[PDB]
Write a protein that binds this ligand. Structure first.
Ligand SMILES: *[C@](O)(C(N)=O)[C@H](C[C@@H]1CCNC1=O)NC(=O)[C@@H]1[C@@H]2[C@H](CN1C(=O)CCc1ccccc1)C2(C)C
Ligand SMILES: *[C@](O)(C(N)=O)[C@H](C[C@@H]1CCNC1=O)NC(=O)[C@@H]1[C@@H]2[C@H](CN1C(=O)CCc1ccccc1)C2(C)C
Ligand SMILES: [Ca+2]
Ligand SMILES: [Ca+2]
Lengths: 306, 306
């Protein structure tokens, strides 16, 4: 028993990280078969930042202008192209550590692991959620751009995020591996407010089920609620609406614990209205929203990766 | 910026995990050069558990009784011995993925990453602390025994923990890689109370410095304190004494932030005496004690591993 904020094992992704330098800037790339993927602002300078002309900057770069290093072994670039906000650098050597992989675009409220990297070398791995406002609350310093976020299923790495920016509010923004931003953000220094963030209600419910599975049951009350009545309370506390799809996704945790989804919703309503009165749930004094239903089932069942 | 509970990249350790079966039980082993290390209770049955005679159980086992699988490739066992609470299985094949490594015995309040494994395959990675009572608050299910905890420094994996038990209180206990338990625990089902746990005061101070580095400064008050006066308050709230060694270890974070260690101690004294009044620090509504001073400096400086 026990419940931790668990990241995916990072080794399959570690074997794909490289360094990309184009004149000035060094950032991280992802090396899969004979392609290196990285943020297109590797081609920018200091003065370029309010509104870079990425097409003009790229027309002025040669294959040989890209210095790609895989553990300080140079990979020769033999082609380059821009796809939305990433570059794709074709190299003359396929990565022999390429895992089975997919590119996926995740939905707000889904979770993934980030392998934070600097100069092509890993610093650390942590789990987070894609906020409802399409930001992430990560740990990213200068040099981390091109770090990726991912999920694993059996032997297959699903890459979902590449890091590009830290907004003036100190939250993080990036793209999918086709280079399309999550959220209404652009890769330039210009005004670009994130939308108001909300709490991921289906994830809080999942975590309350995790608490019950792990014997932390004090918050269970004796009531039930309707879905519509729960949603009127959710709204007031800046929680996302709970949908029938969400109720259905919580069904297996409901069966494991014997606690109907709408009964758990009545317990969450009381926590929102009354607070926790100085108590903790799974070691937290706040309601946790960075575990999906699937994350709870995986961790509580010991699901492994090949 | 941002501050997360960051684990070490797990790939170097992933390449060392195997499965060990001796009749009944399957658990995890650690394969380094031509030796597999695992918990000695792989040799036990159901009836053996109140007080196993590990020497008698082992005299009755053959090399060939140990089925070692590295990704479901069998490794032939050509020798075995018991060292404290682990076995060492000599195999006829050295692990070609062996990293540079050391075995270390960590001190209470130090941190490490756990790679939670089942059937020799990784489930996930998370960071924790060795509690002052020599337990860990992990996430371990049946089948996780033999999972390890580790730190990385440049290219060198320091293995510090191997998982053996979950006490009746739901906390976790294990050994160093020489098989000596942390804490007054034994590998049998018998009464064995953990000592009262305390809060790791030097780690809370480190995390408050992390908060300042990341711009979360609301809790800084205008006062100072003596070390002795701080320790009288620490004592009351079941915090560990802060030593001069700890003050010296916090000196670099003190210099980075401009906040003297004893000034930070005065801010922590006010938080203990008055609470947080519904506020958070780095996203937490409690005072966090699972980051060491070195963990804070590493994360805030982007330290990487080769
Ligand atoms: C990334 O380029 C790198 N090399 O690591 C960097 C990461 C970023 C630094 C601080 N923490 C981080 O996550 N990203 C950037 O510096 C990006 C690039 C220009 C500016 N930028 C920002 O993060 C600032 C964004 C901003 C938005 C609105 C107003 C002002 C600034 C790019 C090309 C967006
Ligand atoms: C480990 O053997 C495994 N195969 O995974 C297992 C891990 C443990 C199961 C539940 N979560 C866990 O972390 N460890 C054990 O089952 C150990 C082995 C016998 C009993 N045991 C316990 O964890 C129970 C400890 C206990 C202490 C006091 C009183 C009653 C029980 C061994 C050999 C200690
Ligand atoms: Ca050349
Ligand atoms: Ca045989």
């Amino acid at each position: 028993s026990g419940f931790r904020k668990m990241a995916f094992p990072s080794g399959k992704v570690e074997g794909c990280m490289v360094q990309v330098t184009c004149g000035t800037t060094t950032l991280n790339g992802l090396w899969l078969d004979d392609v290196v993927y990285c943020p297109r602002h590797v081609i920018c300078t200091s003065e370029d930042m309010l509104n870079p002309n990425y097409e003009d900057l790229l027309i002025r770069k040669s294959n040989h202008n890209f210095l790609v290093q895989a553990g300080n072994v140079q990979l020769r670039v033999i082609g380059h192209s821009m796809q939305n906000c990433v570059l794709k650098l074709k190299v003359d050597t396929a990565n022999p550590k390429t895992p089975k992989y997919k590119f996926v675009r995740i939905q707000p409220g889904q979770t993934f692991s980030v392998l934070a990297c600097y100069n092509g070398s890993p610093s650390g791995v942590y789990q987070c959620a894609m906020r409802p406002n399409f930001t992430i609350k990560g740990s990213f310093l200068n040099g981390s751009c091109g770090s990726v976020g991912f999920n694993i299923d059996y032997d297959c790495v699903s890459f979902c995020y590449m890091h590009h920016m830290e907004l003036p509010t100190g939250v993080h923004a990036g793209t999918d591996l086709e280079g399309n931003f999550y959220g209404p953000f652009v890769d330039r220094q210009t005004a670009q407010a994130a939308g108001t963030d909300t709490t991921i209600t289906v994830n809080v419910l999942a975590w309350l089920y995790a608490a019950v599975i792990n014997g932390d049951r004090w918050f269970l009350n004796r009531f039930t609620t309707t879905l519509n009545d729960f949603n009127l309370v959710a709204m007031k506390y800046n929680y996302e609406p709970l949908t029938q799809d969400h109720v259905d996704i919580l069904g297996p945790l409901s069966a494991q614990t014997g606690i109907a989804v709408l009964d758990m919703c009545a317990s969450l309503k009381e926590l929102l209205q009354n607070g926790m009165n100085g108590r903790t749930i799974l070691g937290s004094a706040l309601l946790e929203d960075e575990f999906t239903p699937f994350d709870v089932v995986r961790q509580c069942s010991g699901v492994t990766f090949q």
